Design a binder for this molecule. Structure first.
Ligand code: CL
Length: 239
């Protein structure tokens, strides 16, 4: 019934970056994780993904009751954690073909044209996007659109979306919001990681967690993100 990070301690290149992270996202809710850059929010996202460069010293990550820290990235996706499929530079690959490859990898079986197009059509309807988009080639903002189509088609139970790399690029933030809002429901939970409050005007969070010095130092409703945007992180560090 929830995605939970419990007493998580982690380090990289021999240095402790996460210092006892406790963060729970109930299935059915969309939460935000904010914080100064380098204070741990993005490192948490990489550890959730299963980035092997990190060493977990203590803690657990439970997805609906099961500890996934020992699972490979592929195994976590099999348990319902969103893992976008990555592709290189390569010419002549339509978004449609790529999505079919991504869905077949996630499902562990072939997916026929009927199942594929029925699912794609539903996703396009929810996103209010034209089917012609699927004819675009990979590598022809844009990377975000492709990931959002995967979000709707792969139907993960939980998704951790780090949008720090979008900054204040409104188009990119809105594409992700369209996808997250389209997935909202009793069977989906999400954690949106961001430095700026901007995206939260498009994706209203049920709860906001703020991370400083490797741990969550404050939580609240959307108003907390608003006050942080108005006053700055230094204000919160003090009180
Ligand atoms: Cl970080």
């Amino acid at each position: 019934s929830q995605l939970e990070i419990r007493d998580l301690w982690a380090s990289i290149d021999g240095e402790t970056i996460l210092k006892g992270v406790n963060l729970v996202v109930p299935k059915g809710e969309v939460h935000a994780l904010m914080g100064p850059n380098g204070a741990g929010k993005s490192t948490l996202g990489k550890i959730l993904a299963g980035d092997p460069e990190y060493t977990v010293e203590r803690g657990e990550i439970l997805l609906d009751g099961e500890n996934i820290l020992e699972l490979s990235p592929d195994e976590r996706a099999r348990k319902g954690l969103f893992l976008a499929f990555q592709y290189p530079v390569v010419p002549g690959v339509t978004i449609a073909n790529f999505l079919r490859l991504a869905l077949q990898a996630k499902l562990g079986r072939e997916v026929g044209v009927a199942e594929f197009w029925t699912k794609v059509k539903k996703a396009l309807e929810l996103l209010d996007w034209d089917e012609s988009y699927l004819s675009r080639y990979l590598n022809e903002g844009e990377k975000k659109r492709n990931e959002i189509l995967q979000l709707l088609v792969l139907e993960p139970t939980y998704a951790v979306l780090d949008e720090t790399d979008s900054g204040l690029d409104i188009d990119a933030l809105k594409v992700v919001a369209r996808g997250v809002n389209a997935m909202r429901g009793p069977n989906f939970g999400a954690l949106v990681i961001t430095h700026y409050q901007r995206i939260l005007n498009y994706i209203q969070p049920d709860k906001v967690h703020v991370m400083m010095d490797g741990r969550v130092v404050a939580t609240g409703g959307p108003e907390l993100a608003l006050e942080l945007e108005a006053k700055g992180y230094e204000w919160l560090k003090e009180k």
